[model samples]
Target: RKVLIISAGASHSVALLSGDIVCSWGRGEDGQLGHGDAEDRPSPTQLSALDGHQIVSVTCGADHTVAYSQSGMEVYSWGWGNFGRLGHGNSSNLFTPLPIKALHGIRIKQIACGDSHCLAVTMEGEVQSWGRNQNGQLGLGDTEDSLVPQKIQAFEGIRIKMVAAGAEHTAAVTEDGDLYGWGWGRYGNLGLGDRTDRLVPERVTSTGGEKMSMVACGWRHTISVSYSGALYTYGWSKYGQLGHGDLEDHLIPHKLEALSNSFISQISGGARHTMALTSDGKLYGWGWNKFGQVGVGNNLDQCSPVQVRFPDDQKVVQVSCGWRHTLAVTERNNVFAWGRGTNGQLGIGESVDRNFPKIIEALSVDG
Candidate 1:
């Protein structure tokens, strides 16, 4: 049996494959690749440090990387460590993966990365945050950056099932289905109906009290899915990232009428683009297409969700995005990439941009 999960960062991408094998490529100047050197990889390179472990998930920041191993009950982080984003109790960059000793005994289930911050959810539904906290992105009610992970006291008694981070903000979903946001609100990414930065977590009233099942963050925008499969978006829409049919910033969350008929199961945000997958395995994309990151077979900006036409018989099981690239995994366990390929971020062994999806033949087992 085999499974695959992909996560994209500002300029790099990481994949967790069957047997907990981790592979990474793209910009590695800051050691985000975890290859024990500052060398860029044009193809998927296995991370030796985690060779014998079974990784449950991996997430990347602008220039940092983090992963969780369910079987090992530990977390590992590397790459740029500025502001202590590595969770290693220091602000030093590491070219190799290192265990996060602070969280050694906890069973981390999920992790989310922002530009310079990160959030981790434990099996017990506890939340911890670290890294750049200048904007209160760490949800610690203060603006002090931490060299090690710190528990979000405000959520001590509540069970947070999911967490997401933006450039300077954070969001989470509680076990009871409530969604809360905090930190920078310059573009209303917090969904609090205002552009006021919050130093502490606050309940988002725009969902009409509906329980949120999932949440995602772009550079300056936010998206969430409801229990009924409804999707809502807010924040900077300069590149039509909000899918509102126009380039207008929103201070509140608005439901996407275009996807109302489809029950979306997953959603992701790039620097200025958004992608979603439905219950039936249909994919939709919108927003910035400057580098063809929207995967719509063209380089035109779309203000509404447009079906991402993949070849016949292909069903997307997961979707992820880098700053200017997009990736998806099919039901057959095949990997397809598109958008910006500069610096080999697409894992196609080429630096040319593609306006359409192309399979990473090298990573295909059948090939």
Candidate 2:
């Protein structure tokens, strides 16, 4: 039962196994655990709700869950549906996983979620969005909540290679390496050098013609990694989430001088924190650390990127952040977690906060 994927939500965690089985744990008050119940799970629990489907990917919102199953050619959503985030054409909470019929014709390649919105990238390179739009987070040209999936026509001819959603914003990277962003721009999260909300997708060209390879959104910030392995960040940095060595909001894309040496391959964000994974299997974390989400053996906030030292230099291949915790997977396929565990989000079978990284033995498989 080797773990092939891992995702950490606001207060829960999800993992995809090699056999296509899905397992979840932690807070389930909003039924985000996808176990057909609303009880918090202290350990990884196999999701019977998806027992018949071969899920390829899984992502989570603050208290909702979305999964894609290529075998079924469907996308399943559950848990909190407030503001229509569940894409079920309603705002009612769900305890069991249900397929989103509105997206029937397309094969989803990836899915991303914010606190109250969801975005899915189709195999055709099209992006579909739904849920809250009060700040135009849906990119639907209006501040209206959508109960069903709506295609962003602005990208009708362009192929989106990737997409990321923040607490109240959305971003997409096109196949040609163009980056487009919209929705809430307060604190300049859109990286457009302004604090105005955008109702439509707008191209971001602040990187001085650098091709962006990846983008990530935090609660009120955005990060982009160029093809040259350079990292750029903008938006709210109240807790130094922007990795700029200070709590100053960047109105434009600012290069991170601190991590210039590490060629970052992946980036992920929590409510007020950020994590970066280097191509050489190193992990760096910064931002809010009241719960030790930075995995720096302390709860002090980090104003700059700091290396997350793992035991035996076990090169970390993947890393993700929850609202108040951190998760990482090593080259050996072993999972490590730390930080706030009040709801067992750490998957260590306890609700105690850990200031240091702890390996999750239950999720490791025999070679």
Candidate 3:
């Protein structure tokens, strides 16, 4: 089986294969690997608990694992359950895959998780939220934690095409290109032009009112792309994660002129770093690089977007970021990993850090 998707958590890594197989490694102290025990795996290990489940997609939070199993179009979660982030109605840590019975019949299409909260999108465009709500990340009109998935009545008429969650905030983009943000705003991660928190969903106007097509939420920052591929960022930048070439925070969306000429097709964020993928398969990274998560061959932090060099014959297709490590996939099915590896999140068999991108021989051999 070949790898089709990859997701990195705070100290763990997850991979989805073409056969719908789920594999995990690193930081399994909380069972984020879904392996039955708390022992961390230095290499990618298949999760047999979900065997033959036909998992369509998977996502990882700071210490949890969430997935959408196509076999029944249901949701399954495991790992840290503090504040009921697992959506299982109780704060109990789980070590194996268990379907959230509350969402048994819903045709869930996508799921997104925060440090201690979770959100899901149904085929009908309805949004469901659960877990931690101390910062109003649940968007349920109050800061009450949800034990199970509850539909957000605030999005009743609007069709949410995509959704993302930060460490404590949440954001969603509509099919109409309208963007809405709520939850933690002390750092302007909500993109609402101020450091004021919003307990309800509020429309976030763009700098030029351009239609938004994508959004990604970092630890305390936010990033969005306009329909024309123009990138916009806001919130915490003390570590230069905002790519504004400054050490100050932006209370509103600021366009990254450095990449205005290229069309960004995808993006992902780590605890304090950001990654952008151009339509032409070029990858760029910026922000906190203490561990070289930026993949620029050093530990110097990048104040602006920097192109990540790849093999001349290899064109990157996708990328994912953990707390400080990163993983990327190429058209040839080759996976490259870099950055912090103290917990074996790199899946390279060694628990060491890398300042530059290195092709994972085990995955590259599939080609």
Candidate 2 lDDT tens digits, 276-309: 9999998999999998889999899998999898
lDDT of each: 0.87, 0.88, 0.88
Could you tell me every candidate's TM-score relative to the true structure? 0.97, 0.97, 0.98
Query: Which residue runs of candidate 1 sit more than 4 Å off their true CA positions?
Result: 1-3, 365-367
lDDT of 3 by residue, 188-223 (tens): 888888888787788897556788988888899998
What TM-score does candidate 3 get on C-alpha atoms?
Answer: 0.98
Instruction: Report how far residue 304 has shifted in candidate 2, in Å.
Output: 0.9
RMSD of each: 1.2, 1.4, 1.2
After superposition, which runs of candidate 3 have C-alpha atoms over 4 Å from their true positions? Answer: none
For candidate 2, the 10 contiguous residues with the lowest summed lDDT are 358-367
Error of 1 at 191 (Å): 0.5
| Model 2: residues with Cα > 4 Å off, grouped in runs | 365-367
Instruction: Report the Cα lDDT for residue 93, model 3.
Output: 96
